Amino acid sequence: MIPGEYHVKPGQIALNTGRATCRVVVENHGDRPIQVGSHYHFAEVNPALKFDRQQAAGYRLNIPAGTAVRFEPGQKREVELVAFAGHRAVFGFRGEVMGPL
Amino acid sequence: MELTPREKDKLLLFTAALVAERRLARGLKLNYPESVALISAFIMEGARDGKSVASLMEEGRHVLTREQVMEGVPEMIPDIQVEATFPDGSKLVTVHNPII
Amino acid sequence: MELTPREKDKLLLFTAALVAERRLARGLKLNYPESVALISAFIMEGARDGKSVASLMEEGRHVLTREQVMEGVPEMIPDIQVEATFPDGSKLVTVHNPII
Amino acid sequence: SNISRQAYADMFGPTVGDKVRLADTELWIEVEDDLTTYGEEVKFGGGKVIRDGMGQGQMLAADCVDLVLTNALIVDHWGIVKADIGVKDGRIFAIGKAGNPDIQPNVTIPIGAATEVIAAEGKIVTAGGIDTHIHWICPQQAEEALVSGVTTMVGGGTGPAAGTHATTCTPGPWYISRMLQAADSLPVNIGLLGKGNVSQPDALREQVAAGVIGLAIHEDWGATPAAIDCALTVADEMDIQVALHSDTLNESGFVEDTLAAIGGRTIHTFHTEGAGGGHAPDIITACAHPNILPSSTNPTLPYTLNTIDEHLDMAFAESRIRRETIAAEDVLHDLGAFSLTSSDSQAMGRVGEVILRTWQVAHRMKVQRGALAEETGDNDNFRVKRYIAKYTINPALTHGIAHEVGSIEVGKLADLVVWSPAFFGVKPATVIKGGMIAIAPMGDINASIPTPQPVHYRPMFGALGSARHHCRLTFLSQAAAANGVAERLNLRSAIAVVKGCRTVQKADMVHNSLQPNITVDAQTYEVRVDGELITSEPADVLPMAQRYFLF
Amino acid sequence: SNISRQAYADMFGPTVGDKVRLADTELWIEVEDDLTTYGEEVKFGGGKVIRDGMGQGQMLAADCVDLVLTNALIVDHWGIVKADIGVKDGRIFAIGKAGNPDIQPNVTIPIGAATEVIAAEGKIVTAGGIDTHIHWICPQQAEEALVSGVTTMVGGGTGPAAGTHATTCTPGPWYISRMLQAADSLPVNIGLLGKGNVSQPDALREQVAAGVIGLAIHEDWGATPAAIDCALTVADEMDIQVALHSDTLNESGFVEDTLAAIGGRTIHTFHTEGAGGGHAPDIITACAHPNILPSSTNPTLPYTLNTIDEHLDMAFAESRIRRETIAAEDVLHDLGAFSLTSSDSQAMGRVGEVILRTWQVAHRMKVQRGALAEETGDNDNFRVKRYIAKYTINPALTHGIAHEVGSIEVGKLADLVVWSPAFFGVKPATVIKGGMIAIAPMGDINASIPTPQPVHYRPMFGALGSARHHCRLTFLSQAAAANGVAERLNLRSAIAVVKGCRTVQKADMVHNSLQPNITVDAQTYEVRVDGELITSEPADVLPMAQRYFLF
Amino acid sequence: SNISRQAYADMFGPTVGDKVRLADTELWIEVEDDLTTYGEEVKFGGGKVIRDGMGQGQMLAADCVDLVLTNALIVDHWGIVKADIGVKDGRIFAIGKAGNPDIQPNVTIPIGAATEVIAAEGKIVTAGGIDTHIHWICPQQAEEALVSGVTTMVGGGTGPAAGTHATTCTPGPWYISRMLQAADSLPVNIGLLGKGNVSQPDALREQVAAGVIGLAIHEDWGATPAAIDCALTVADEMDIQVALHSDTLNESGFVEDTLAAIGGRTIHTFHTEGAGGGHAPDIITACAHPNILPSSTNPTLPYTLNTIDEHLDMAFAESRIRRETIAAEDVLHDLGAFSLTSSDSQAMGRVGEVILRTWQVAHRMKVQRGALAEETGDNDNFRVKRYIAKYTINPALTHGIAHEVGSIEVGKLADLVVWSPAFFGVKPATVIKGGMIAIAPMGDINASIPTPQPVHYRPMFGALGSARHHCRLTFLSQAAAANGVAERLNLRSAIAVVKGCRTVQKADMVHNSLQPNITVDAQTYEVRVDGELITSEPADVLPMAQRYFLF
Ligand code: NI
Ligand code: NI
Ligand code: NI
Ligand code: NI
Ligand code: NI
Ligand code: NI
């Protein structure tokens, strides 16, 4: 008997289903670590991360909400992106779009 | 004495611990608030003695065992935190999974 | 601990009882507030141990005798009441004419 | 991508199909629905979702909520679901999917710069309880009740005076006015009851016009058929509720005569079992009538080993305290025959145990009688909805305040309670009043974080001066509101008016509308429904007891 | 029918001829009269008398009292009688026979639907004490005093500052205004005193116009003949009282010079014995004059074994603390030469011991000197009336507030204290302010009744926000009231104005009007009245002490 | 006549040339000047100087001060001098020689009948501290801070909600309004900060117009260049301050990009060392810029043996907590590179340890590095002025409230703290707010003097109802003041408006204007100024610790 215990049924949850995704190889060219958030507009991440910014336009990391991906200096890795939904209007970040798309 | 609010607040923890300490002595399986109060008072006295944060983080896990507390209590306390005045000022002590 | 107001209020009774308990040990004839505090704390610990209301209503009358308290004190306390968490929840214990 | 269910629960709280144990009881709830879009849940923290341009939009204050409770597991009379709760202007704005419509799909609760966040993942959220049987013996009762999760208090009294010790009555205009003013200092919604024991209508109309939202008829002031009929007459014309504590002595007549005087008019019967007062020994039969809204006081809930011994001190002693009716009461609650639970604060009841005891009854009933006929699936969801309604929506309906509080529904005042599953019904994580946290457990004030010991309940901003006034309601009778009582007394808190007290009937009690063919044996005191004997066994140990309390 | 006297006392409290011991002292009072009609006493409870159509009538609120104290044993300067007390609009309505004129005879206090009830059978009821020597060192003093039974506090100060530690002065308009505003937060009636030590009249008139009801002359600010005469001049024109603490150092002259400066004008002499301050060693001789209203501070009441040892720390030390005058003071009180008792809060006095010590003096005096010449019958009634007047009516007369408080008389504010005979003067059962209970002993807030432990004093509704404002008085000078000070400072409490300060004289002091031919030996410090030596022995043990207190 | 220096110090406090040890530290101050006229010092008490016609004049209230602090040893950023302090209308009237011009020479602070007196001989008097990094997690923080000597609190929050736990933000108009109202109940000056994380200007302007005096940018809400630039734009047009907690994750860019977005505009960088948040691992380099006003939070002050072990719980853990930057911070403070100290209340900081820790750093720095290049004479006066400015004037300048508080200068609000030399920085003797004592250590309330045990901090008159309102300030933005926010919310306290937030720069920071050529090694995390390595050793024992606290 454990007070307030859960009884989660076994299985898995499929995240962001029915949405366009694309894989991109990314390399940290900076001398300091960079950690990106699940909903951060990828095309506007730290300028030290080298990758095809054009492809990541309107995309964010295809990871569970709230989590992150870290890139140590010199690190190179392939990540998967999923497209923004809603109005597909990007506001903020580095201010490169500030509108729809 | 010029007791500030925090010193008076800690007197509440100390007294709550006197309650638990007596019950444990009678041989009772301590409950949730009793366990937290007992392990917390222990740590504060540790700082008074001048022990380091690192030492207490360890010693704190050896105050009460799973067979000295009621069922479910160990799981109700994933960790215990308390601050006290060490020789080098106030420091926070965090004991993870104090009861095993 | 997440202490509610009533748990904190009871800490006052417990502490008032520690005062009386020490004085009785020195061999003093306890006064009014001391007697009430001492007999009350006894009952609360009774419930903690899991004794029934009926048992405590009886045992409560055998904590202090007329020769252990100041003159007039027995008559100043026609009965004593205190609540505590028994295994089956909060219950009221009434001890009539506790001091004889 | 994909994520295992266990990891998901640890991160965002349980989802559809997952079960959760309520405290240390045998009650298990199961998430019936989840309003989120997997992968789009909002989470707060460094690097998390609720950040500018991401889960937080660019809209102005008017276009977004003031507060959002993320990933809350709602437990209400209408459902046990997972969703985000939006709060705007101190009231429940919406129950849906929160986020930023700019980048997220299905957002119904917009988060903007003006949005504060409360992380409820892994927590159970419920409406604030409503106690309709308060004896204002001392002002400290409000704190005790608030800490337990009761956000509204209805009753009467003027302090530690004989009248108030014995009855829930605020006698006359002067005392009523004084109490209405004192109420502004209390962190809970309040509504007063006046002394309804008079055979002169004008004497009651004055009290209603002075401010009371109901009239309490108590046997100590004379619960005679003449008095009862008089109170009910004024109640019918002023749209206020009557709470009854009948003639235990059977002095003016038996229960059937009282019922006869009531004459099919709406009335709330206090502690219908009888131990707290009422025609000995069959006041309990009242629960069979359509115009009767029955409630129980808490010292008799649930039937345990020490109940009887305790009650004798707390000739008509043995006629009032009957093991037979005490046991039956628990079953009658499980069946929906009794619709409310209350305290009867410091006059044969415990102010901070209304919620705690209601769940103890549910537990003991599951243990003794198993699943209810209405249960579906392998959970206790229906029993949870039936019992939670007892101290939330039903009390609100009975007293005509259900338009303001009582449940988590849009447009209602945001009186919410957040609970950690392991302390459900016992010790709340957060107690929100009118959109602001009023009381919560708080650790060392000088600590580097709010968690170090000692942790105990301390008042918050929602309980301070003018902020408190803005977050609490003082319920007035339609007449008092019209006479400008609030302006005359210079009441500082928000005002709400009661309505719909006369039209509610047993059938309107959510999940508790049973009208059983109940009988009580005049001699043996045995309670029978349809001839079958109703009873239960006394518990020797209960959950939500020694494992949580220091004393 | 018939009922034995003992059974009657246990049911309705003692009646005519019965005696009652005051606490654990040797003082015995005897009921002088009983205003009831035997068999028609009102009692509250299930089945009792106060019920609709029975002891409760059908009259409207305007035709009945708001509160009734049933079967109260009144102990006041005017009599020790048994009767019901009626309270209407926060003021004493009547002292008589309560009930319903419809069925009961001789009813003078009508009970109706709007009537709240306090059962005082077996209890002693008294007016609230009035301390006229407060040093506002901390706001916590009001609670301490209220719990002891003192409902009015007069004095001055601005907090823990040197000036206030030493004197009862609220210096100037700014501080006076600040204190008048802070006063609304305190549960007692308040009246401020300003610094009267100035030889420029306009500087005093400003303070009186700012709000003070008196001017305190203190030696620490310079108690010179020029200063004294100046304060008295303004006092004569503004109808305010002057409280004096003379020149102990004899710097400007001796006691005869001070008396000469006073010039037969009304003045209240603080701690007239001298230990608390005043011309060494004969300030005590002032009690022989008709214009002098003398009071004692409490640390010297009564003379005990530890008094002297204690006072030294609390060259002019031995000239100020004199065993001879300390012993005489107790006798002078017993004779009616000293008319008031006060505390001198935290500046050589104990705020919560004014009442307690006054009774200890009475006890010790009975023990040492026996019955007073005025006693009649085998009781101590006259001595009780003489001593109770010391902290009730006399202080009220001295400061010009006797029209509002000071005694249980109709039309006066309902500041009452209920006592259980065993705790009289020590720990009150109920403390009523302006018609509402402000503080009372209260047990477990979560208990099923208000009696379970721990029981300690907690604030009640009468001490809450706006209710408190409505139940307390802030005393202003006639000038401050006229200048609209209450409106300018936006004072929220009820206002009362002082009057009749200049016309009171020693002869007006109830039961304490003795003007003895007293002399003090400049060398030996011996006190003599008519040549006979006045003195008493130090008590080793006192009642109302170790039997009641935890520390 | 003549008097020895030692006897003089014991009587009137130290004078020119005398040194005093600060608590139990190695810091020694030396009286630089004394504004008195020897033999003419004012002293209060029986027979002393402050008496009618003597040290007290005959002038009216308008021609004399309301309060005088006699023989105070002032310790402020401008000097360490001996003088009397005059207070009139809740503000500092003068710093000079008090007395009566009628008989005394050089009197600049006139004492009259309306003057209250505080004896400060032998005490150290300082301005009240100002904490600009408060997380309003609970209202109890104000008492804790007030007791420590901090009289002003700037920050944000709405209570124990996730947003507030993590950030200093009061989200939107509704919450801002609610907090402004709740603030009237707190005994400290308050100014709120809103959530500045938005890329839509109108959403920020609303908050500023609602009442906030600044906007806090926090990484948890998204500290992106777009957000930063947006907040700074509105700040420039509304004259409010921006407090920054940068992107630790380096998600949107590194520190140089953040600096680039700031674009040379004025900004206050929170916990510039980084442990509390900020670009890992070189946010510390920000202290080299002229537009950056840098502060430290207190858990890292000073570097001790347990600091690191403790911080881990309080992948990016090791990147955020760096021994190298933690040690450097202490030195950077000693050099004047870091200009402020704050708490970061219950979110990685201790509310009641801002003052205490600042002095511990000074002590450890003296011990490790000896005298500063600016020191003159054999004392630590310059180091004391440099460090006291960190929690007084500099925080006041940074947030545009230096015209109201921050130092002991004429015309400023009288927020003063009196200290006994042995408890300096640890436990205050008196805490004066707006001219009234708000909190002070107080002994037995029933005692014959205010000194008997137990002595602990209790609220005074300056913390009561309307008196408190009159003695505290609620800081508004110029826009909120213009829109009539105070009248709309019906705020009861005094109002002050902020101005000059955009024009302050590093050069304006008193005694802390150093802009060092600082670098941080991306790998080793080593801090270097001009190539030389900056570092210090961890203390094993500190003063102002175990010798003063019970726990
Ligand atoms: Ni009832
Ligand atoms: Ni009841
Ligand atoms: Ni005096
Ligand atoms: Ni005095
Ligand atoms: Ni921060
Ligand atoms: Ni912070």
What string of DSSP letters covers F332-359? HHHHTSS-EEE--TTSSS-TT-HHHHHH
**Cα(C10)–Cα(C12) distance, rounded to whole angstroms?**
5
Token output for F362: 């000074």
- Neighbouring C-beta atoms of residue E372, cutoff 10 Å: 17
Where do the DSSP E strands lie in D1-147? 2-4, 19-21, 28-30, 33-34, 67-76, 79-88, 91-96, 98-99, 109-110, 116-119, 124-127, 129-135
Q: What DSSP element (H or E) covers F216?
A: strand F214-218
Angle of helix F354-369 relative to helix F381-388, nearest 10 degrees?
150
Contacts of D201 (CB under 8 A, 6+ apart): D230, D233, D234
**Cα(A80)–Cα(F157) distance, rounded to whole angstroms?**
37
Buried b (16+ CB within 10 A) or exposed e, F229-261: bbbbebbeebbbbbbbbbbbbbbbbbbebbbeb
**Cα(F359)–Cα(F365) distance, rounded to whole angstroms?**
10
B38 to chain D, closest Cα gap in Å = 11
Distance of CA E85 to CAs E33, E68, E105, E108, E416, Å? 14, 6, 17, 10, 10
Buried b (16+ CB within 10 A) or exposed e, F276-299: bbbbbbbbbbbbbbebbbbbbbbb
Query: What is the torsion angle, in degrees rounded to the nearest 10, for the CA atoms of residue E443, residue E444, residue E449 and residue E450?
Result: 20
Q: Do A90 and D11 touch (CB under 8 A)?
A: no
The one-character DSSP state at C64 is: S
Please report residues of F whose CB lies closer than 8 A to that of B91.
Answer: 306-307, 310
D contact set with C (CB within 8 A): 140, 143-144, 147-148, 304-307, 309-310, 313-314, 350, 352-353, 357, 360, 423, 427, 441, 453-457, 539-542, 544-546, 549-551
CA atoms within 13 A on the CB side of E112: 28
Token output for A19: 């949405």
F 108-167: CB under 8 A from D: 136-141, 143-144, 158-166
Q: Do C1 and B26 touch (CB under 8 A)?
A: no
Breaks (C-N over 2.5 A) in chain F follow: 314
**Cα(E167)–Cα(E161) distance, rounded to whole angstroms?**
10
Distance of CA E93 to CAs D174, E409, E496, Å? 14, 8, 19
**How far does the centroid of ligand 6 lie from the alpha carbon of residue F244, in Å?**
10
Distance of CA D11 to CAs A65, F188, F314, Å? 9, 40, 20
Question: Could you tell me which of F172, F161, F66, F187 has the C-alpha nearest to residue F473?
Answer: F187
Distance of CA A13 to the CA centre of its chain: 18
Q: What DSSP element (H or E) covers E5?
A: helix E5-12
Q: Do F144 and B85 touch (CB under 8 A)?
A: no
D546 contact A CB<8A = no
Distance of CA E212 to CAs D4, E134, E142, E413, Å? 76, 14, 18, 21
B78 to chain F, closest Cα gap in Å = 13
Token output for D477: 């009778």
Token output for D348: 């044969």
Beta strands A12-14; D2-4: pairing state:
antiparallel
Check: CB of residue F193 under 8 Å from CB of residue F243: yes
Residue of C nearest to D429 (CA): C2
The one-character DSSP state at D63 is: G
Give the 3-state secondary structure of residue D156.
strand
Check: CB of residue F250 under 8 Å from CB of residue D79: no
Check: CB of residue A36 under 8 Å from CB of residue D46: no
E98 contact D CB<8A = no
Helix, strand, coil percentages (3-state) for chain E, rounded to 5, are 30, 25, 45
Check: CB of residue A93 under 8 Å from CB of residue A40: yes
Can you identify the CATH homologous superfamily of domain B1-100? Urease, gamma-like subunit (3.30.280.10)
Interface test mutation site (partner F, options B3, B4, B13, max chain F beta carbons within 10 A): B4
Of residues A3, A11, A66, nearest to D43 (C-beta): A66
- Neighbouring C-beta atoms of residue B45, cutoff 10 Å: 15
Give the 3-state secondary structure of residue F118.
strand
CA atoms within 13 A on the CB side of D240: 34
Question: Could you tell me which of F65, F75, F70, F83 has the C-alpha nearest to residue F15?
Answer: F83
**How far does the centroid of ligand 6 lie from the alpha carbon of residue C18, in Å?**
42
**Cα(D56)–Cα(D38) distance, rounded to whole angstroms?**
18
Residue of F nearest to B6 (CA): F144
Q: Do E158 and F461 touch (CB under 8 A)?
A: yes
Where do the DSSP E strands lie in A1-101? 6-7, 12-14, 21-28, 34-37, 49-50, 59-61, 68-71, 76-83, 89-90, 99-100
F268 DSSP β-pair partners: F243, F293
Q: State this model's resolution in angstroms.
A: 2.4
Token output for F446: 């029933």
Q: How many residues does chain C have?
A: 100
Check: CB of residue F418 under 8 Å from CB of residue F412: no
Let me know if chains C and E touch, i.e. at least 3 Cβ pairs under 8 angstroms.
yes
Question: Could you tell me which of F72, F65, F75, F71 has the C-alpha nearest to residue F29?
Answer: F75
Tell me which residue has tokens 């808490």: D298
Check: CB of residue F146 under 8 Å from CB of residue F188: yes
**Cα(F55)–Cα(D335) distance, rounded to whole angstroms?**
85
Check: CB of residue D285 under 8 Å from CB of residue D329: no
**Cα(E128)–Cα(F58) distance, rounded to whole angstroms?**
39
Neighbours of ion ligand 6 (CB under 5 A): F 344, 347
**How far does the centroid of ligand 2 lie from the alpha carbon of residue D167, in Å?**
6
**Cα(D432)–Cα(D188) distance, rounded to whole angstroms?**
10
Q: What DSSP element (H or E) covers F478?
A: helix F478-482
CATH number of E128-406+465-550: 3.20.20.140
Size of interface C-E (CB pairs under 8 A): 63
Distance of CA A90 to CAs A59, B3, D101, Å? 10, 55, 11
Helix, strand, coil percentages (3-state) for chain C, rounded to 5, are 55, 20, 25
Angle of helix F323-335 relative to helix F381-388, nearest 10 degrees?
110
- D101 cis-preceded (ω within 30 degrees of 0): no
Continuous H helices in E184-238: 201-210, 225-238
Ligand of minimum distance to the alpha carbon of D156: 2
**Cα(A7)–Cα(F178) distance, rounded to whole angstroms?**
41
B71 contact F CB<8A = no
Distance of CA D133 to CAs D33, D192, D350, Å? 35, 10, 11
Check: CB of residue D507 under 8 Å from CB of residue D291: no
DSSP D322-388: -HHHHHHHHHHHHHTSS-EEE--TTSSS-TT-HHHHHHHHHHHHHHHH-S-TT--SSS-HHHHHHHH
Token output for D438: 């009023």
Q: Do E453 and C82 touch (CB under 8 A)?
A: yes
Beta strands D124-127; D416-419: pairing state:
antiparallel
Token output for D501: 């007290």
Check: CB of residue F441 under 8 Å from CB of residue F124: no
Experimental method: X-ray
Query: What is the torsion angle, in degrees rounded to the nearest 10, for the CA atoms of residue D523, residue D527, residue D532 and residue D534?
Result: -140
Each domain of chain D, given as residue ranges in start order, spans 1-127+407-464, 128-406+465-550
Q: Do D304 and C11 touch (CB under 8 A)?
A: no
Where do the DSSP E strands lie in E32-149? 33-34, 67-76, 79-88, 91-96, 98-99, 109-110, 116-119, 124-127, 129-135
Give the 3-state secondary structure of residue D47.
coil
What amino acid is encoded at B47 in this protein? A
Of residues A37, A73, A91, nearest to F251 (C-beta): A37
Distance of CA D515 to the CA centre of its chain: 22
Ligand of minimum distance to the alpha carbon of F348: 6
**Cα(E495)–Cα(E483) distance, rounded to whole angstroms?**
13
DSSP D407-456: SS-TTSB--EEEE-GGGTTTS-SEEEETTEEEEEEE--TTSSSS-SBP-E
Question: Could you tell me which of F55, C68, F11 has the C-alpha nearest to residue E222?
Answer: F55
Q: Do E161 and F117 touch (CB under 8 A)?
A: yes
Interface test mutation site (partner D, options E455, E466, E468, E472, max chain D beta carbons within 10 A): E466
Check: CB of residue E97 under 8 Å from CB of residue E152: no
**Cα(D400)–Cα(D292) distance, rounded to whole angstroms?**
15
Task: List phi, psi (to 5°) of C59.
Answer: -55, -30
Of residues E162, E178, E353, nearest to F446 (C-beta): E353
Contacts of D118 (CB under 8 A, 6+ apart): D67, D68, D69, D70, D418, D430, D432, F161, F162, F163
Q: Do A39 and D101 touch (CB under 8 A)?
A: no
Token output for D208: 């209603």
Question: Could you tell me which of E298, E297, E300, E304 has the C-alpha nearest to residue E542?
Answer: E304
Give the per-residue SS3 of F54-70.
CCECCCCHHHCCCEEEE
**Cα(F513)–Cα(F516) distance, rounded to whole angstroms?**
9
**How far does the centroid of ligand 5 lie from the alpha carbon of residue F228, in Å?**
15
**Cα(D488)–Cα(D446) distance, rounded to whole angstroms?**
44
C56 to chain B, closest Cα gap in Å = 18
Q: Do D450 and F349 touch (CB under 8 A)?
A: no
The one-character DSSP state at F3 is: -
Token output for F409: 């200068």
Query: What is the torsion angle, in degrees rounded to the nearest 10, for the CA atoms of residue E381, residue E386, residue E392 and residue E394?
Result: 150
DSSP A1-30: --TT-EEPPS-EEE-STT--EEEEEEEE-S
Q: Do E445 and C6 touch (CB under 8 A)?
A: yes
**Cα(E190)–Cα(D493) distance, rounded to whole angstroms?**
28
So what's the architecture of F1-127+407-464 in CATH? Roll (2.30)
Contacts of F531 (CB under 8 A, 6+ apart): none
**Cα(B17)–Cα(B32) distance, rounded to whole angstroms?**
12
**Cα(D548)–Cα(D532) distance, rounded to whole angstroms?**
38
Distance of CA F199 to the CA centre of its chain: 32
C30 DSSP β-pair partners: C69
Contacts of E527 (CB under 8 A, 6+ apart): E284, E324, E325, E327, E328, E332, E518, E519, E520, E533, E534, E535
**Cα(C42)–Cα(E404) distance, rounded to whole angstroms?**
48
Can you identify the CATH homologous superfamily of domain A1-101? Urease, beta subunit (2.10.150.10)
Distance of CA F447 to CAs C37, D94, E472, F450, F455, Å? 24, 58, 26, 7, 11
**Cα(D151)–Cα(D147) distance, rounded to whole angstroms?**
9
Check: CB of residue F203 under 8 Å from CB of residue D113: yes
**Cα(F13)–Cα(F82) distance, rounded to whole angstroms?**
9
Q: Do E182 and F461 touch (CB under 8 A)?
A: yes
Check: CB of residue E307 under 8 Å from CB of residue E356: no
Q: Do E444 and C16 touch (CB under 8 A)?
A: no
Neighbouring subunits of C (3+ Cβ pairs under 8 A): B, D, E
Token output for D31: 């998430």
F413 DSSP β-pair partners: F91
Of chain D, the end-to-end C-alpha distance in Å amounts to: 50
Check: CB of residue B75 under 8 Å from CB of residue A2: yes
